[PDB]
Amino acid sequence: DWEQYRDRVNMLQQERIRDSPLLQAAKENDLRLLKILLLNDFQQRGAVGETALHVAALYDNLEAATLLMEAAPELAKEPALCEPFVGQTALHIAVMNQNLNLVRALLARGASVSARATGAAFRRSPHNLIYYGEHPLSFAACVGSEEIVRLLIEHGADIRAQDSLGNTVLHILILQPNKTFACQMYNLLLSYDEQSLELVPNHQGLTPFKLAGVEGNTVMFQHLMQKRKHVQWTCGPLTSTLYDLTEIDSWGEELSFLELVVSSKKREARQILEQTPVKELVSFKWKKYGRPYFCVLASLYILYMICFTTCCIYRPLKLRDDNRTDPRDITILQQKLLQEAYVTHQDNIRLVGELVTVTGAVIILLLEIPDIFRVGASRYFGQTILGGPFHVIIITYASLVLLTMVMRLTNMNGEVVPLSFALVLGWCSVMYFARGFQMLGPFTIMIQKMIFGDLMRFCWLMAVVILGFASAFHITFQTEDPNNLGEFSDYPTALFSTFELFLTIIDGPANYSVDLPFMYCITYAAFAIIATLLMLNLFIAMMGDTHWRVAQERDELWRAQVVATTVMLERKMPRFLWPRSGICGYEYGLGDRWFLRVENHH
Amino acid sequence: DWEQYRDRVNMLQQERIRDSPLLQAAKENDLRLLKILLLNDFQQRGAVGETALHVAALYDNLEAATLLMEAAPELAKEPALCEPFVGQTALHIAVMNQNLNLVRALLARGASVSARATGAAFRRSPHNLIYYGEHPLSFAACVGSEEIVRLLIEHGADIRAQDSLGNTVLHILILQPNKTFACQMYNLLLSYDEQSLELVPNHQGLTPFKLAGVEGNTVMFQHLMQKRKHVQWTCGPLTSTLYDLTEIDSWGEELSFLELVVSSKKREARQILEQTPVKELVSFKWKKYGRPYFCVLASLYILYMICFTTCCIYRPLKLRDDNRTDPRDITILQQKLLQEAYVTHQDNIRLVGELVTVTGAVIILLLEIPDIFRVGASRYFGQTILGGPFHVIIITYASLVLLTMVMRLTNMNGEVVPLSFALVLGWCSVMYFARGFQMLGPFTIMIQKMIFGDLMRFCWLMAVVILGFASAFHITFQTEDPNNLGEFSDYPTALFSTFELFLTIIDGPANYSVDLPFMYCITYAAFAIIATLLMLNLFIAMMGDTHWRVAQERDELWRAQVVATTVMLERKMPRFLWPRSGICGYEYGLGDRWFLRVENHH
Ligand SMILES: CC(C)[C@@H](C)/C=C/[C@@H](C)[C@H]1CC[C@H]2C3=CC=C4C[C@@H](O)CC[C@]4(C)[C@H]3CC[C@]12C
Ligand SMILES: CC(C)[C@@H](C)/C=C/[C@@H](C)[C@H]1CC[C@H]2C3=CC=C4C[C@@H](O)CC[C@]4(C)[C@H]3CC[C@]12C
Ligand SMILES: CC(C)[C@@H](C)/C=C/[C@@H](C)[C@H]1CC[C@H]2C3=CC=C4C[C@@H](O)CC[C@]4(C)[C@H]3CC[C@]12C
Ligand SMILES: CC(C)[C@@H](C)/C=C/[C@@H](C)[C@H]1CC[C@H]2C3=CC=C4C[C@@H](O)CC[C@]4(C)[C@H]3CC[C@]12C
């Protein structure tokens, strides 16, 4: 376990500090015994691998630290050695504690300004509570001190230093939860930059602009957009602003800014889409091109669904050759063969309809299966922003249509099974296009939240109630005639009848001409009290609570779904139908950049 | 597109400012190169059509503006020429920026005080963020400056100047969203008025009083009612106020104040009906005359509905001459002819009842069809204040009754179709009279909001669910005997049965004497989980959320419906049954005005 190993490391470090007298005197700033010991091994290390100067920097002992840098000047260069803190120097712990004079004394003794703390306690992990980087400059930028940052820069710290994750100091500053003073430190560190430091990619390929978009740092995004705007004029309450769309539109890039924002796992990333360039950019993209193309694609999919349904209704069936020996058997028709089916003109119309259906199912798999590999199977099917479960049911519908096609070509009986699954899933996949409308999109998201929410727990306890009462009903009617009351004659029939009686979609089985057992009456009274009266209306109460508790999240989810649909439509549709958004700067002498003009009222 | 043209105009204006050195020096207030250029074309124009003095007034450059009015005194008279800003002078941009000394210097050089900015960026449009008028006096009244208003008036600006929309400066002041300081500017501009400026109509025929009523400017209405009130006395906590009803009652006018207020498309116009004269005026009108007349009209309509229903029940039917050849055919009666029907005394009673029904349907079309033309088909049927959908179903009911009348006179079979539509619509039109009661009016409005709200989206996804499961059920029972389970024998029958099974108004089809396919069991279990359990109760949860989220709007909608019903009853009923409201001033020597007395407690 990671917690037990870190706990053992911490108590071992404290124990080896306690056993060593030099480490103890560096811990509680005991000057007298320090002078006695330094007058009388100075490079002894603890369990972490740290020196006594590390202990003095850890416990904020300035006098003790100056004492052992006077006695041992080389002690200000050695880092810790063992795994959880390897690379940590005394400069790192002095910078973390914001001790200005200790940092000055360490830099006077020869502390490295580019020491890399590559330990496991400094990586960006859920194990670590903080992620301040690996360099002392990143640590000083993240603790919140200006003066140690200027001191480290004037002593020769690399501003463009990258850690093991590839993050520069700008990336680590953006990854902080302060979100307000990090802009001041960003301005301070950009003052010393004058390629740019703002265009140095991450190991994930992210600029600091793209990292601020992904992590949902809205204040940092607004601060970054100040340097990319230009106020054209201000006339009274009206002002015209010219936002740069180079980093935002990301034309020609395989992974754009908006694609990374709408496919981010953070809940705060959807608030980037409501900012001052981005909201009107995606609104213009949706109003001018996204909505009509989504509407005609929805119309084409509805026509394709109508064609598939009409091919399902007119499927080839012949009269059953085998006689109905069993009285309970009611099958009078059976499937036709390959040569027996397509012999008429209506069969040729159904043939071209089925060819259109198979062509549409192949086209569906040519558009979805590449999209799993570009993003990932966890994000393509798990993110409701991109249309997660809808892609699952669409891929399943295409697979079932191809299974029915090879069933037809192989002449296997039982086409009704994949045709029924394909019909239900393909028709329920038309709700994917509901996200393009304000009337239906939030309701579809609420359906998605209720299916994976209240319905799952309700069905989980419903299985228990239905199993118990179905077993009780089946053992109650195990001694009676199944002709007079056949709801509980067989145990699967008892389970189905009890499920239907819970949902009250069938009547309570009562035959007044005969004498039912009293155990059925008592068990069904309890079933009607607990299942019908209590549980079926408690589901309505629970969904009524959960409906108003997630309505705001539902609206923001729908807005981000509209933006992600716009991004998907711009990525997949041809370029000649999706012109580049914004105003071209080459027509007006502003270089090769594209801008978006916003006129606001203050 | 209007946004792209305005964006191109703005970037072209900035580009032509950037290319020209005179426009550039007027932009960033470069005095040195300005003196060099003026010592060395001065009337050059940009893309907008503006001079360099326009640029100096736009970028608030006082010294630059004084420089080119010293060099070119005629430059302070030329307006912009091209379409989006035609008529805009430098005085307009100086007034917009609230530059007092620049306005003084322009007026010293000979700037026109009555320049009309007839461009497309100054009209009252949703394209423009502001509507400040076309004259510099309206601009100075709307930016919020007293001093430039007094300066422009003392320099000879017309206070009664009207723009292309016909609005005076009072109208444009009322159309501002400040709503508090606009009263101070209204008092300032009325101080210089002393026909009155307050009685100058709009091109829509509106006074500033009527414009404040239409736009829902409640603070401006309260400020306007201070000049039309008169405190008779004040005795302790009791004070008696005498409000003038000349502008409010609008006796003799075809388009009154209250009719314009209740038929306004703004949501804030319904708050005018709660103000200090208007609320008690419409309350006295409703309590004294509106409620009893509405009650007796509702009673007459209920009696007419009873007569029409009784004529529908006793309709002439004869025994079917053709034999029932088809076993499924159950039609045993058919319609009588014209000469065959009215042969008895009960047939004569039904004849006079049907004549009363046709007379009522003709009277209905004589009262509604004129009212569409006076207001408009979008507002008569779209505004729930006036009874929008109720007029639609009433006109449809009258049309269906006349269609049944010509069907009877033409002897066409199939009267049951328009008689069924007419019965349902005419009986559901009795809910129009529910607005006169506190118990039923808000509930009727909530029904209207739920029909066009949650029910529409629920039915839109319900069509998808029912279509998919109906197709699955029909292909499941395509091979079985239709005698033992005929719910899904035909595809329209499968669609109807699946809709009924979703709403659980029929039982789940189960025949325990025969063996149903397992695909029906799996598909119906999924149908009962998704449609019956999830969706049918999620509709209740969604309507429970939407009920409490619009309840206040429901109450205000009902109050405005009561006021609009009072206005309609006063307009349509004869004058001898609706006496003029208020206290006549001729009986007490106060001229020919009518007043309403309000006694309040402070
Ligand atoms: C007998 C078979 C056909 C079984 C497996 C039935 C499955 C259907 C009824 C279920 C399986 C997964 C379901 C499902 C998953 C997720 C969503 C997203 C939501 O926003 C709209 C509804 C929607 C689309 C629903 C509709 C109902 C579906 C499609
Ligand atoms: C608890 C949740 C997950 C819901 C969906 C479960 C419902 C159970 C009670 C339902 C769903 C599918 C049903 C079902 C499907 C098909 C058949 C085949 C039929 O010839 C005998 C009954 C039988 C075996 C029934 C029994 C009851 C089942 C198992
Ligand atoms: C088979 C036919 C008769 C079809 C078309 C039925 C239509 C009826 C049921 C529908 C059509 C329009 C509906 C309708 C529209 C608007 C309103 C306003 C609301 O505040 C009260 C209910 C009311 C009055 C409802 C009642 C139900 C009506 C009248
Ligand atoms: C989705 C919303 C808008 C609601 C109202 C739609 C409901 C559908 C499922 C209903 C409404 C009217 C129904 C309907 C009306 C009349 C007939 C004639 C009958 O001889 C065969 C069934 C048939 C054809 C059914 C089929 C199911 C329909 C089409």
Numbering used by the authors:
A (entry chain A), B (entry chain B): 28 to 67, 71 to 224, 230 to 637
Text taken from the publication that reported this structure:
Transient receptor potential vanilloid (TRPV) channels are a group of six polymodal cation channels subdivided into two subgroups by their sequence identity and functional properties. TRPV1–TRPV4 comprise the first subgroup of non-selective Ca2+ channels, TRPV5 and TRPV6 constitute the second subgroup of Ca2+ selective channels. TRPV channels are blocked by ruthenium red (RR), a universal pore blocker for a wide array of cation channels. Here we use cryo-electron microscopy to reveal the molecular details of RR block in TRPV2 and TRPV5, members of the two TRPV subfamilies.
